[PDB]
Symmetry: D2
Subunit: 325 residues, 4 copies
C-alpha cells in the first residue's frame, strides 16, 4: 500500500475539513493523467505538430487538448469559481450551483514546441482562494479581484513533468513534495518528500542564443560564470521551463529568463508560470525574483502579464543579483 | 493493425533472407521495453537515489541477456564493461554489437531524458572470433563505414526507437498498450540549415580558440539569430537535432584532449544515423565513420548535425 | 475526448464523505487489479495470498479516507474501528476478493461492498443500506454500483487509472432463458428445486441456456446484463446456505433490486432479513423478476 | 530481473527461423486483441455489427477486429502460405515470395457472446506444415491439400485466454507450456511450464440447458455424474471453450460438446477449435475424442467441418465413452 497524493492531501487538511482542496487535486490529477496519456501516444494518434493565443503563440494540438482536459475536470470538480488558462484570452466563471472557492490559473501544457522532439514538457497551476466576503459573478468581477491579489496570497501551487516518468510536484505553504505516477494503478505516489533546493550549486540555465539582446549586467554575470578562476559552472537548458525548474529544484543551480531588447517586460507570464514556480522554489528553500525583488510580491495588473525570472539556489541567485548592483 | 518495427524489418530484408537481423532487432526491442519499464517506476522501486547508477547496471543486464539469447551475436561490447564478451559457441551469430545501454544516467533523478545507443557490425568474411583476444584484433581492422546498422532509443514522455540500415533513417514510437514499436517518423531527413546550437557553454574557458570564435559568431553575427538548447543527454539532444535541424557539439577540452564521447557505442552509431538522415558528422579530422578503431573505450570529439551548420563550424577551424 | 469518470459522476450525484469513500474503494480496486494481472510472475498464485493482499488494500485506503467509522471484512472475524480523529459516518462490510480459488485458472473474480450509514450495531437490515457495489476482475475491469437510485456500471481505463461510465442505468431484463447454478450438487438439493431445474430443461415451451462460471461476482454481473437467474440453493450439507449475508448476498441483493430484478432467500427478500451475526449465511435466488418468480412458484407447489 | 520470454523459449526449442517469426505474428495479434478487449466498453466495440459468418454466427465487432489483426500480422510474417479463419468462407493464400511453409487455421475470437458480460474469451490456432513437394498457388490447391491432412500431422497448436491475466498456452509435440502476458513490457513470460492434466478429477463441463436434445447415452452419463453413490462431481461451465478447456487442463476434469438433435454433426469446428485443443489436451496427458475416436485421427473434408468433443482427464473421458458403448 503506497502513499497516494490523494491520501497525502486528505491527511494534510484539518480533522473533517471542507474537502474542496481534495476535490480540486483530484481534478488536477485526472487532467494530468489524461494529458500524459495523450502525449505518450501522440505520434500514432496524429497529434504531433500544430493546428492549421493571447500571448501570440501559435498552438500545438496538445495545447488545445490539454486545455480542454484541465477545464473539463476543474469545472466539474465543484471547487473552482474562476479559471484562467494561458490558452484563453478571458477568464472563465464556473456556473452558479457548481461554484467553489478557488481561483486557478494554469498553463495546461508548457514547452509545447518540444513535443515533436520528445523533449520534456509540463503543466503548471497556481491556486488562490476567493477573498473572504467577495463573490465573482462575471468576467468583470474576476478582473477586478485578480488586481487586488499577490503571489503571497497563493494557497497552493504545483507542476507536472511529462518525461520518462511522470512527476507531480506541489506545495501548500508548508514545503514542497514530489510525487510520481504509478501507471499500473493511475495514482500519484509520494517519491520525493520535503524537496530542499541546495543553497549553492554550479549549474546555470538560460538561452545563450539571446546573448546579444541581454542587458550588460547579465552578459557580465554569464561571462563570470564561464571565466572566473574559483568555481567551474555547468550549463543546462532543456528549453522547457518545467523540465529546467525541476532539475533546478532537485540538483540546485540557477534558472534565468532575463530582460530582452525585444521582450522588455519579459517572456514568462506572471499568473500561470512565474508565480507558481516562484512559490514552489521559495518553499523548497530557494529564491525567486524578477526585475524588482520577489515575484510573489509583484502586483497583478492583468491575466497575461509578463515578467523576467531569476530562480534557484539562494546563493546562485544572490550572485546574479550582485551583478545587477 | 498498425505497422510494427518487426514487420518493417522483415519487409526490408530480401525474399527468404537469413533472419539473424530480425532476431537481433527483437532482442533490442525487448531490452528497450524492459529498460523503459524500469525507468518509468524507478522512483517507487528505489532505483533513483533521492533523500545514481543502478539503472546502468539493470540496463546492461537487460541488453546482454536478450542479445546473447538471440543467437544473432558473436561479440558484445558495453560501455559498462571493460572487456568485450563472446557469445557461447553454437549460440553464436554473425553480429558484433557495441552499445551504451543507458545514456545520460545522471539525468534520471531529475526526469531529464535518457536513451540507449547501439552500433552493429557484421563479422568480416573470413574471420572467426573465439576469445577476447580475437575480438580485440578484429575491432582494430574495422571502421564506422563498415557498420551495417545503428540506432538509439529515447526514454521520454513517449518512447522512441530510431534506426538505420544504410538506406535512410526511420523512427518508431512504443505503443505501451501492445508493447510494439510503431512506425511514426518514416524517412527522417535532417534539414540542411537550422539556427539551433547544442553545446555545454559552461566549458567555454577550456575550449580551443577557434571554437570559442564559432560560438561567439553564432551569438553576435548580424545576419541570423540562433537558439541554444542543451538537455545534457546526448540521445535527447541528437534526436532534437535530427528532427528540428541544428548542430550538436562536444568539442576538444583542455582536460579531455581526446574528447568526452566514446567512438564505438556513442559517436559512430550517432554518426551513421546523422549521415543517413542527410546530415554531416565529423570529429577532429573528418568523418567519424572514417576513423580507425584502436580500442573499445576510445574517445573522440563530435560536431554533428545539419550539413551547413557543421560546414560553418568547420570553417572556423581553418586555423 | 474527456470521458466521464466515476468520481465526477458521484460529485454530480450528491447535492463530501461519500466521494472520499468511493475514492478509497477505487484505489483499492485498482491496486487489487494490478496484483491479479501479474500474480503469475510475482509468485502470488499457488500452482489465497491475494485474499490477504486485497484485504490489506481495502483496509488501508478505507481507513485513511476519513469517511468510515467501522469496517468489517470477510477475512476478519472482528470488526475494526477507525481511530477517533479520523472517523466518518459509514459502516462498510466487504468481501475484498470473491472467488479466490479461481485465480490460478484465470477465471473471473471480484470484490463486493455494502455501505450503511450511522446517524451497538447489533442488527441491521439490508433495507437501510445506503450504497452497494462490486468490482469484476476480468478481461476488462468493471465497477458496478448503486446508491438507491438505480445501478450504473463503470470500466477501468488502464491508460489513466480512472473508472469511466460505460453501462449507465443497468436494467436487468424481466425475463431471460439463462440459469446459473452448480448442478454437480443435484442430489443434495430440496425436491422442489430439483423439479424447477428439470422443468427448465424438459419444458416444451422455452429453451434455457446454462452458465456457471463459479464466481459469484462474475455470474451476477452476467445475470444483471444479460438477464437470467443465479441460484445458491439450500444444501443437505449447508442447510443455512453457502453465501454470507452481510458482505455477499445483501450488497448483491440491493444491486439486483435497483436494476429491476428480484433477490430472495429462504423466506422472502434478502434485504428484509435480520442480521444476527457477522458471518451469517443464506441461500440466494437472484435475477430477472419473472425467472425468480418461476423458481419460487415451484417452492410454493 | 530478465525473465524468460515466449520468443526466447521458442528460439531455444529450435535446432531456420520461420516458426519464430510465426510465433511473433501470433503474439502481436494476441496483444492487439487483448488491447481492444480491455477498452472495448469505452471505444464502442461492445456488442455486434448491424447487418452471419460461414458457420451461421452473427458476428461481434471484436470478431472482425480480431480477424483483421491475425491476418495482418500472419501474412506480413513471411511464414505462412495459407490461412483459414472461422470468420472467412474461403482460405486465403499469401502473395508469392511473401509465402512461407505454414498453413494456419484459427479462431481469432472464441466466446464472442461473452464479452458484453466480461466473461473470458480466447483465440485458438492450429499449425500444419505444407507437405513435402506440394505447392499451394490458389484456393483450389489449398482445398485439395487440407483434404489429405489429419490432426496427427499438426506441428503446433495453441490458444490465448483473455481474462484478468492474459495467458498463451502452446505445444509443438513435446508437451504443453503456458505463458502470461507482462503488460509492462508486452512480452509473454513462461509461468506454467510442462502442464500436465490430471488423470482423474471430479469436474464436468457442459451446457445442461440442452439436456433434452442430447442422445440417451449422454443423458445417462450426466445423470450418473450427479446420482452415483461413490464419487461427487462439481459442475463448471463458463461458456467459453478456451476458458473451460484452460480450467480443464490445469484442474483436470471433462469438457463436452456432445451431439445435438439440431447440430447432428456438432457445434465445434474441426480445423480451428477441436483439433488444436485436441493436440494441446493430448500433449498435456489427456484424451480428446469425438464421435468415432481421436479428433486428431479424423479426416478433414472441408474448412468449416464440425465435430462433437469429449476432452479432458483420460479416466473421465474413458468413463464418458463407457456409457456410449453400453
Ligand atoms: K504556449
Ligand atoms: K561517462
Ligand atoms: K473473500
Ligand atoms: K463466432
Ligand atoms: Mn502552454
Ligand atoms: Mn509555458
Ligand atoms: Mn551510459
Ligand atoms: Mn477468503
Ligand atoms: Mn466471498
Ligand atoms: Mn470459437
Amino acid at each position: 500500500t503506497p502513499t497516494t497524493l490523494t491520501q497525502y492531501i486528505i491527511k494534510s487538511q484539518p480533522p473533517h475539513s471542507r474537502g474542496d482542496f481534495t476535490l480540486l487535486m483530484m481534478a488536477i490529477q485526472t487532467s494530468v493523467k489524461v494529458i500524459e496519456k495523450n502525449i505518450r501516444r501522440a505520434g500514432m494518434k496524429g497529434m504531433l505538430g500544430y493546428i492549421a493565443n493571447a500571448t501570440g503563440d501559435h498552438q500545438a494540438k496538445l495545447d488545445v487538448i490539454s486545455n480542454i482536459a484541465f477545464k473539463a475536470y476543474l469545472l466539474s470538480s465543484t471547487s473552482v469559481c474562476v479559471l484562467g488558462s494561458e490558452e484563453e484570452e478571458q477568464m472563465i466563471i464556473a456556473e452558479s450551483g457548481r461554484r467553489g472557492d478557488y481561483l486557478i490559473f494554469f498553463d495546461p501544457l508548457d514547452g509545447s514546441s518540444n513535443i515533436d522532439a520528445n523533449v520534456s514538457v509540463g503543466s503548471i497551476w497556481g491556486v488562490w482562494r476567493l477573498p473572504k466576503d467577495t463573490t465573482i459573478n462575471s468576467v468583470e468581477d474576476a478582473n477586478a479581484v485578480i488586481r487586488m491579489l499577490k503571489g503571497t496570497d497563493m494557497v497552493s501551487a504545483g507542476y507536472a513533468v511529462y518525461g520518462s516518468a511522470t512527476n507531480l510536484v506541489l506545495t501548500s505553504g508548508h514545503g514542497v513534495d514530489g510525487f510520481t505516477l504509478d501507471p499500473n494503478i493511475g495514482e500519484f505516489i509520494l517519491t520525493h518528500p520535503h524537496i530542499s533546493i541546495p543553497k549553492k550549486r554550479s549549474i546555470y540555465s538560460v538561452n545563450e542564443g539571446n546573448y546579444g539582446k541581454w542587458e550588460p549586467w547579465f552578459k557580465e554575470y554569464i561571462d563570470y560564470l564561464k571565466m572566473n578562476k574559483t568555481t567551474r559552472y555547468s550549463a543546462r537548458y532543456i528549453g522547457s521551463m518545467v523540465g529546467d525548474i525541476h532539475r533546478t529544484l532537485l540538483y540546485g543551480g540557477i534558472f534565468c529568463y532575463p530582460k530582452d531588447a525585444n521582450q522588455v517586460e519579459g517572456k514568462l507570464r506572471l499568473l500561470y508560470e512565474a508565480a507558481p514556480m516562484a512559490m514552489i522554489v521559495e518553499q523548497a528553500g530557494g529564491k525567486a525574483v524578477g526585475s524588482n525583488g520577489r515575484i510573489l510580491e509583484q502586483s497583478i495588473t492583468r491575466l497575461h502579464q509578463r515578467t523576467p525570472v531569476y530562480f534557484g539556489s539562494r546563493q546562485e541567485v544572490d550572485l546574479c543579483m550582485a551583478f545587477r548592483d
